[PDB]
Amino acid sequence: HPNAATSDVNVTIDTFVAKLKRRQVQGSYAIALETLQLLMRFISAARWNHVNDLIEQIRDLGNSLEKAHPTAFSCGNVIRRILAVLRDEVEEDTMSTTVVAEPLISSMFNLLQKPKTDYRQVAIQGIKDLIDEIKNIDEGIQQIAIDLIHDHEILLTPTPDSKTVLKFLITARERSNRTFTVLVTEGFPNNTKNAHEFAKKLAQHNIETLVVPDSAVFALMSRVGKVIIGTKAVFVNGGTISSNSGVSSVCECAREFRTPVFAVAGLYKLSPLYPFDVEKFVEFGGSQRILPRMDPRKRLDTVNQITDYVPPENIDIYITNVGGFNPSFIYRIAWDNYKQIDVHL
Amino acid sequence: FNITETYLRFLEEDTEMTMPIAAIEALVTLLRIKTPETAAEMINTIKSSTEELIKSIPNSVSLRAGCDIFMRFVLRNLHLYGDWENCKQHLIENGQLFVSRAKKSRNKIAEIGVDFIADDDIILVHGYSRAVFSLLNHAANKFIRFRCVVTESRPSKQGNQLYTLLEQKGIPVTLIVDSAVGAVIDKVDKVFVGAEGVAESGGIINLVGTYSVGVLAHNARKPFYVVTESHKFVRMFPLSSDDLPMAGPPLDFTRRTDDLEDALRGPTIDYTAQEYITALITDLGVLTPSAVSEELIKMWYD
Amino acid sequence: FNITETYLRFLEEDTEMTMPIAAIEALVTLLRIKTPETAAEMINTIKSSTEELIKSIPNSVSLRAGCDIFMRFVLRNLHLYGDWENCKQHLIENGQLFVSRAKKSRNKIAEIGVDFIADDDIILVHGYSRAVFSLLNHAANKFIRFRCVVTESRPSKQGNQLYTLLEQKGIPVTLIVDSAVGAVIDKVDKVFVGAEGVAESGGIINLVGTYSVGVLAHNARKPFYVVTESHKFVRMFPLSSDDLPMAGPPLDFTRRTDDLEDALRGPTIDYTAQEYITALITDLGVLTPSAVSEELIKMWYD
């Protein structure tokens, strides 16, 4: 389905498409907020009267949105989240229009046994609840996370880019009973500016700040207590796509030294998609920022990548607003929020 | 009426009628003759026929697993306390519909599990399952670039059988021995496996050298794959590395011989732990670690 | 006079008088005819005959190592500036004395290396060498208890050959396949391996699946042995896991075939790193890691 029907009524579709492609929109948290407001505008303005035609139209809109931008997983997840909230209330509504429906638990196994209202209002409130969930994640993290780190323990941190992780670290430093040393890898080609702002905000709160070059990670791993990841997107198998540069090697460095790896994330950040290949999912950077002069750049074919991937073999905990989970369990948290059909849009 | 004889009739057939799906279809035919109206007369005689089937089994595991799912579906039928007749008609019909579901699942997986094989990747394939080879064939149908390495598995000589079936497709191959399989993990992108069963724990029930493959790959950090159709789940928990249901030898040491007759005896089926599997693929979505157990907990309701 | 023809004459012979020691004896016979006094006329023709021997080699390493030691001894003869006749007579005599030293070394090792096999220990043996089997036989002569597990090595079906040679002694055995070799490392006390060559680094030059054994044993924490006669040392340093001197294939991938002819091709000789060896046994005392390199530095004086 094209945007020929939604042009005069809905204009904000194409402005978000423009914000993605030229990267005017920044950070998964912000991308999610925009798509929420998009779906807010879609229900408030449209006229449908039919339900199944409506849902499949939303599916096509989400399909086009993910094809417009592949790194906008937070875009894809938010739509999928509302899709499932819709689908449950429709299945509840169809049971009343026809007239055990309660075997034991809330399972799966869709391959075994076979099969006017205020539905739109529920769809409205469903968006509102998603916003409030994205608004408050930190409160749900701090009650699980600030229980695992000890005094006189040294924390090494790749990806200082995450707003989520920094605020988790500041709530722990607020506790006068807890003392920790912070090592921060620079992440040269991208994270540099963000890493420097990270080091500034730690000094602002008076926490023992240590800026580390990306070479020196090994030269410290014997002294490191714990490793923390500022992830962008979490997956089915457990693994993460993080906010750029110098993570994968650090995680490899940690596993060889058997140093524990922590991850701070949200359920909206969590994705029901599977990373079959890193080759497709990871976005590559601009080599302009590395080396000047274009006549040597004929012979200097430089390689730089933004997003970095970590395999599930390294990290152990994904502390969310709900709680702490192991990578060998995170799939269930995902299926508790997104349906099996709501994957291939 | 016999059930073991009906399974024995599939000799030159196979391939389409998968080994468990043919045993499940044989279970439905035995059910539909002597009236499924009675639950005392029928279920007890179904249980006796499965027990007779297990007693006739030499080295198969999946037939026991397939029986369980059938049983489960039968019990779930009249869980709504519905008419003792429309529930019965739906039960008899779900025999041909069960075999038809093996085709639909294969249609699903062969489009899902081609994504894992990326642009120009050398694969070392071990074992033979109808799901893994269907991925390999329908990727060649998708016009994707991949190299193949054949493992010399020794049950009824499976490596040679695999090699010939790869020749019929049009994909370049060479024979690699399971002894030298360690010396290959550097020019191999990914290691794939087809399982005889998947454990309650999350481990694997497989052939004459699969654990050995799993460990070496864990050393080389190169990925290890399991691809199957979603019916090979038993409530089995092999506690140790060398403990499995057997009708033959669990490692026998023979006396001094001159004519040379008693020799071969070694563990033909071997287990590997949960940690060694990087990825698992079935029609029930894309899932690996704790997923298998959750499936079994959902089925057994215990 | 030929040297390759003299080596070809040993067909029904072999054993005790080893393959390298027969090549060294062939080197001495070629030397003693055409006057060993001249160092210009002879040494160049000795070098050409070794070069012709290397060109005729299909899959052997130890012949190149044995030539080196001979050369070294020849050069060391007239290191004392002695009579150009008494030093020559001592050089010719050290040919039959070299082969006689293979007897004395085997007499030493089979009394030293029986100590490693303790009271009632199950052994898994791979890669047949004359030194390791001589330990196995002279421990049975010592009346000690030991169980044996046969590995199905695939160069020219060596496992079956090993199994038959164990039957002629009176020690209980059973066939274990190299695929399933991972499933055995729990009931096996110790793993013994006989080498085709020992590296400058401290690694091993061996057969169609030995690295795979080395790694699995490192995972299972069960000891890994190397037992040989002290002549299999080359100034060789395989930098990587898959780099070796070959006359045949370094992993070939063949085109689409229907008649089935081009298949087998896999790495017949494989390297394992220094870390995987727990212990090494030769006649030059009881020593394992850097010991090999010290020996090589001591010989080459470089």
Residue numbers in the entry:
A (entry chain C): 10 to 108, 113 to 128, 147 to 376
B (entry chain B), C (entry chain A): 4 to 305
What is the paper's account of this structure, in its own sentences?
The structure of eIF2B–eIF2(αP) complex was determined to an overall resolution of 4.2 Å at best using the counting mode dataset only (map 1). The domain is inserted between the N-terminal helix bundle domains of δ and α subunits of one set of eIF2B subunits rather than binding the central cleft of eIF2B as proposed in a previous model. The density in eIF2α-D1 leading to and including the phosphorylated Ser51 is visible, however, the arginine-rich loop following this serine seems to be only partially ordered.
For multiple rounds of initiation to occur, the GDP on eIF2 has to be exchanged for GTP. This reaction is catalysed by a guanine nucleotide exchange factor (GEF) eIF2B. Here we have determined a cryoEM structure of eIF2B in complex with the GDP-bound form of eIF2 phosphorylated at Ser51 on the α subunit, which sheds light on the molecular interactions between the two molecules and provides a basis for understanding the regulation of translation by eIF2α phosphorylation. The structure consists of two eIF2 molecules bound to opposite sides of the eIF2B hetero-decamer.
